[PDB]
Amino acid sequence: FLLEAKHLRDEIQVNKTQIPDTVTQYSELYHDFTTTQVGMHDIVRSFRQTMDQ
Amino acid sequence: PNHTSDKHIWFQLSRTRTGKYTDYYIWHDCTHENGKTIPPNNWLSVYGNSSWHFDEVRNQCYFHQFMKEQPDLNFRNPDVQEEIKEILRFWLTKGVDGFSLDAVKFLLEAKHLRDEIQVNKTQIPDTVTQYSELYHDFTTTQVGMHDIVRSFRQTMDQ
Ligand SMILES: *[C@@H]1O[C@H](CO)[C@@H](O[C@@H]2O[C@H](CO)[C@@H](O)[C@H](O)[C@H]2NC(C)=O)[C@H](O)[C@H]1NC(C)=O
Ligand SMILES: *[C@@H]1O[C@H](CO)[C@@H](O[C@@H]2O[C@H](CO)[C@@H](O)[C@H](O)[C@H]2NC(C)=O)[C@H](O)[C@H]1NC(C)=O
Ligand SMILES: *[C@@H]1O[C@H](CO)[C@@H](O[C@@H]2O[C@H](CO)[C@@H](O)[C@H](O)[C@H]2NC(C)=O)[C@H](O)[C@H]1NC(C)=O
Ligand SMILES: [Ca+2]
Ligand SMILES: [Ca+2]
């Protein structure tokens, strides 16, 4: 959950015909812009490098 | 390193399901009938209409970033990476002093094969054909491409 997308775009609904204002459960959206972004593994490797001292 | 030609021996062996060559290219099932093909998704090519093209021998659709005659390789298969490393070593041992890699942002693509977000949300889904009418979040700069580039650098370091 470290990094998130910078373009701040909406995520794809699992139920494409569901009304946009009736979605409140975390399991009703595909999480492509909020989890496992580009650069998180670099942060983890930086933590490992810091611990290597 | 991203793609080869459809006249390459690798693609000729792949389209007939011959050994380990069966999985050097991104293949997927599709519906072709009465001279019309339904692509798995709405991904568009850089130079044209669709990124998925049907084939007769395999009865499946293959993936091309640029043109229908340029099948895209599969970098999720370690054998392709080994072949690329072999080519790099072959060219390095002849005296070449350096390489300039072309189109490294197009290496990896998303595995979930989900539609991309339209720029014009109210545009009719079947009237989108220009590469500039879609946000490219699932086809460019995926997770792991930089690792492939670093692997290339490690190979060259020898
Ligand atoms: C969630 O998906 C299901 C199918 O996967 C659908 O549910 C139907 O949607 C219709 C549309 O009006 C509604 O009548 C009901 O919600 C469902 N069918 C019936 C009549 O029971 C739809 O894609 C999504 N559901 C909703 C809330 O529309
Ligand atoms: C593929 O792309 C073309 C061009 O982007 C689209 O329109 C075709 O354009 C050529 C060039 O003049 C015409 O010869 C075709 O008749 C056009 N196709 C039509 C009108 O359906 C179109 O999206 C695609 N065309 C083809 C032939 O696949
Ligand atoms: C593309 O976006 C523009 C605005 O950004 C919109 O274009 C209007 O869409 C309406 C919907 O029917 C159509 O009348 C015209 O295409 C445009 N308006 C007028 C009155 O010309 C819309 O979001 C998208 N365009 C299309 C093709 O619908
Ligand atoms: Ca965070
Ligand atoms: Ca590729």
Side-chain angles (χ1 to χ4, degrees):
Chain A
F1 302 100
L2 291 204
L3 286 185
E4 308 92 16
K6 288 197 285 187
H7 49 65
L8 297 184
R9 276 203 282 277
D10 284 3
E11 284 185 351
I12 309 168
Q13 303 186 1
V14 180
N15 200 328
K16 266 80 173 176
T17 58
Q18 177 164 350
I19 318 297
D21 59 352
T22 79
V23 60
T24 50
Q25 270 67 239
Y26 183 78
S27 64
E28 289 177 349
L29 285 182
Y30 290 106
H31 311 292
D32 307 305
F33 304 145
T34 46
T35 57
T36 310
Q37 295 306 299
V38 170
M40 183 278 288
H41 286 294
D42 292 345
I43 296 173
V44 170
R45 292 158 175 151
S46 166
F47 289 161
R48 167 86 255 170
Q49 274 291 311
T50 295
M51 293 177 70
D52 270 358
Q53 308 309 315
Chain B
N2 176 64
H3 53 278
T4 67
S5 173
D6 58 335
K7 303 296 178 64
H8 203 292
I9 194 64
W10 294 351
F11 188 78
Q12 291 298 326
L13 297 187
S14 178
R15 64 185 291 173
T16 61
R17 306 146 171 289
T18 306
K20 73 180 184 181
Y21 302 104
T22 307
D23 293 333
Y24 288 171
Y25 296 90
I26 298 185
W27 291 94
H28 195 274
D29 284 328
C30 51
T31 303
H32 184 45
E33 78 277 15
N34 61 41
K36 184 64 180 294
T37 298
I38 296 90
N41 45 13
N42 72 333
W43 291 355
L44 308 189
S45 176
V46 182
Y47 292 117
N49 295 319
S50 167
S51 309
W52 299 96
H53 201 254
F54 188 58
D55 194 358
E56 294 297 328
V57 179
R58 192 142 161 162
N59 304 95
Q60 269 179 293
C61 286
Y62 67 95
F63 184 65
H64 58 91
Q65 279 282 305
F66 295 115
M67 299 270 285
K68 58 180 286 296
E69 311 91 358
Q70 275 162 288
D72 197 339
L73 284 174
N74 186 356
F75 283 163
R76 294 189 198 282
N77 190 333
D79 302 352
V80 177
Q81 293 179 356
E82 191 59 34
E83 297 270 28
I84 297 301
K85 295 168 141 32
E86 291 300 324
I87 285 156
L88 277 180
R89 285 189 198 109
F90 167 85
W91 278 116
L92 269 168
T93 187
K94 273 202 176 299
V96 182
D97 292 324
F99 294 107
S100 167
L101 315 168
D102 189 31
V104 290
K105 59 183 276 193
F106 302 100
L107 291 204
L108 286 185
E109 308 92 16
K111 288 197 285 187
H112 49 65
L113 297 184
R114 275 203 282 277
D115 284 2
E116 284 185 351
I117 309 168
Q118 304 186 1
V119 180
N120 200 329
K121 266 80 173 176
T122 58
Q123 177 164 350
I124 318 297
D126 59 352
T127 79
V128 60
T129 51
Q130 287 69 240
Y131 183 78
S132 64
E133 289 177 349
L134 285 182
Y135 290 106
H136 311 292
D137 307 305
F138 304 145
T139 46
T140 57
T141 310
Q142 296 306 300
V143 170
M145 183 278 288
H146 286 294
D147 292 345
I148 296 173
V149 170
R150 292 158 175 151
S151 166
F152 289 161
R153 167 86 255 170
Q154 274 291 311
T155 295
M156 293 177 71
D157 270 358
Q158 307 309 315

